[PDB]
Amino acid sequence: IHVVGRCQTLEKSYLRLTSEPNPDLIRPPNILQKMYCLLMDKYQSKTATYTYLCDQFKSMRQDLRVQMIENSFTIKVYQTHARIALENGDLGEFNQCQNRIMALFENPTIPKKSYSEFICYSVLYSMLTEDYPSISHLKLKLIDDGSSEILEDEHVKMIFELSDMKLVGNYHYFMKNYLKLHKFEKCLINSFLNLEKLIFLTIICKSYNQVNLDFVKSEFNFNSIEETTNFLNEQNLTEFILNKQITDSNGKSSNIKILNTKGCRVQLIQNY
Amino acid sequence: DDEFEDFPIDTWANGETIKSNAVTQTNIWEENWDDVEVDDDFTNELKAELDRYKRENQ
């Protein structure tokens, strides 16, 4: 028999449960649902700290785990904390939620709302953890599950394709496919995008002897050339940004900014 | 699923291994990777479309 709770106060703070549960402090789902709305209000109006929302969500999550509620409301709470966690950089609570969501999708009684969205988060997190077996074991699961509607969704295909593009260092389409990502997908990529930019920058610098600064700027989706040079200054490469004047046909001239990528080679191989 | 851990024969002599018979048997791995040309429809048409390029770019 599952433990049932009757706490009528909407708020509750997280504590790792050491005792056998106290029904007087565990909230029933109707009260957990009334506080979901208040939390959502606060998040939407941005009148609360993420620390505060995360505490309230973990307590909401804890009250569901002791009461054995695995239904559509449960999926809603975990999907909502997962999303908010990604928005604030809390990859640890995202991953706690993501694992539980996937396990709750194994239940046939629970409808698979936003299955493809969280399939995408699973691929993107495995890209961050450098966990390619997981990506492949999940593609194989979808195939053996008969989930062809999900697999031929253009967005899902792109996300799996992105994991392959990182694997073989295709900076050109990976950065070009960064603009196709949904709101929280961008938040997840940002956890490892600096290192990925550095990995892409090494590849460029091992392969050319010099490139335009604009060409570097375009390929890395820098909104302006100032954040382009800040990114090189973050790698101790500012002195390799040289200036060379140009007269292609001896009829007009101008000066362009060059990056001596051959000079950058000596610097960037020291760090990896 | 299917057990491949259960071998049909538990042991054999060393003289009966490919490695030990490998002075009797030639290399299983062909090593002409740099110099092997193969002739098939694809290769033949690859030279075709490239001979065309050399003719227009003389």
Binding site: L167 | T17, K19, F42
Partner: protein, 410 residues
């Protein structure tokens, strides 16, 4: 009971140890000289009673007579075998190395004991894994420097038992521990190498250990160079012996699933591809429906630089490659194919001139975009060591090295 007194083992002992296979009508199944009060002598005597009971169960195990569930009776057999093997561990912990292969045959059939059960909600595998972990440990740390009783020569045989258990349900953390600990141990010479281990006495475990290592290295930790090595060595130690009845290699199955990983791993690391006529490749590739066309076509597209054929071969058998743990290998091996095409436009389209226009490769901002994408794919190959060249965005060309332009390890 002279095996335990005078520290030797025979087939009769192994046949007594074999509980799955029933014994003939005349039985010699008995212990000897029973008037002992030593605690450790009753460990042997309790072991003897556990053994006779285990053997008897199989006679009644087949005779369910449609009773219904036997999961409890199966669980009876399992703790029968587990407190028996945990007791053999109590015996083998401080005995000489005579008694390690009897420990292993016991262990290996307790794996097939939990192998028959198909339900992992009630899996009793934990008992086995712990029991075998101790068995691996009892040999792994032997404090006797003299080798008469050293049990660290069976260290690798027992690792294959754990590999087998760790692969049952996908656990790539647990396999990873075992590879990394063992590597260190022989490098410090705490255990002897596999070629001078107890695995040479039973060479089935020789091939298996190189498989588990090479598979882990190639499919899980993405170390292809080492993955190729151990898988290749696993095939080089397979017996050239055939079954009389069909004339096919005795280990046809073992050889083929090694070959599934070995062939594409061999092309990626070292640019090696098989001799199809050669007895060993031909004996396996041609007699396996799965590999009979896929792999000749797969090798062909790489050698020839045929990108579409490779992509079609990978698209058509993606389920197969995914289930074999070959996705990264396939995905990385496709860029070898792209590099060979690049080599072919060098040989035949630019006259081996180290300066090559990028528009050559277009014949095989639409055009500006295709060239940007082409620079980037060449840049990644340059940066990975498939091309020794450098790019020029300005003239939209590539500049091959004057020496070693298309390197590959050998």
């Amino acid at each position: 009971g002279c095996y335990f007194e005078e520290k030797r083992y025979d087939d009769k002992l192994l046949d007594f140890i074999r509980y799955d296979v029933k014994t003939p009508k005349k039985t010699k199944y008995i212990l000897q000289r029973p008037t002992a009060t030593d605690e450790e002598s009753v460990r042997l005597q309790r072991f003897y009673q556990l053994g006779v009971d285990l053997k008897l169960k199989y006679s009644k195990r087949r005779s369910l007579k449609k009773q219904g569930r036997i999961k409890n009776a199966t669980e009876e057999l399992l703790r029968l075998a587990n407190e028996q093997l945990k007791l053999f561990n109590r015996i083998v912990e401080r005995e000489t190395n005579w008694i390690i292969y009897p420990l292993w045959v016991m262990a290996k059939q307790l794996i097939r004991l939990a192998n028959e059960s198909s339900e992992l909600n009630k899996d009793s595998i934990e008992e086995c894994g712990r029991t075998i972990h101790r068995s691996f440990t009892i040999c792994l740390n032997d404090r006797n420097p003299r080798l008469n009783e050293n049990k660290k020569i069976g260290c690798y045989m027992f690792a294959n038992l754990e590999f087998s258990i760790y692969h049952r349900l996908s656990n790539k953390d647990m396999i990873k521990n075992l590879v990394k600990v063992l590597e260190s141990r022989v490098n410090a010479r705490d255990i002897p190498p596999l070629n001078k281990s107890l695995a040479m006495e039973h060479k089935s475990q020789v091939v298996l250990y190189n498989y588990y290592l090479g598979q882990y290295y190639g499919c899980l930790e993405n170390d292809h160079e080492r993955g190729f090595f151990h898988l290749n060595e696993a095939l080089l130690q397979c017996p050239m012996l055939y079954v009389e009845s069909t004339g096919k290699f005795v280990l046809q199955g073992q050889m083929e699933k090694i070959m599934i990983l070995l062939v594409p791993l061999a092309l990626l690391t070292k640019r090696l591809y098989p001799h199809w006529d050669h007895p060993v490749i031909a004996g396996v590739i041609t007699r396996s429906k799965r590999l009979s066309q896929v792999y000749p076509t797969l090798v062909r597209s790489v050698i020839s630089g045929n990108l579409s054929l490779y992509e079609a071969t990978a698209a058509s058998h993606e389920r197969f490659f995914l289930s074999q743990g070959l996705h990264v290998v396939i995905t990385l091996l496709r860029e070898v194919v792209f590099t060979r095409l690049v080599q072919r436009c060098w040989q035949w389209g630019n006259d081996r001139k180290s300066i090559m226009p990028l528009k050559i490769l277009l014949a095989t901002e639409d055009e500006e975009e295709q060239l940007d994408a082409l620079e980037c794919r060449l840049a990644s190959a340059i940066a990975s060591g498939l091309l020794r060249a450098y790019l020029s965005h300005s003239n939209r060309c590539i500049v091959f090295s004057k020496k070693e332009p298309f390197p590959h390890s050998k």
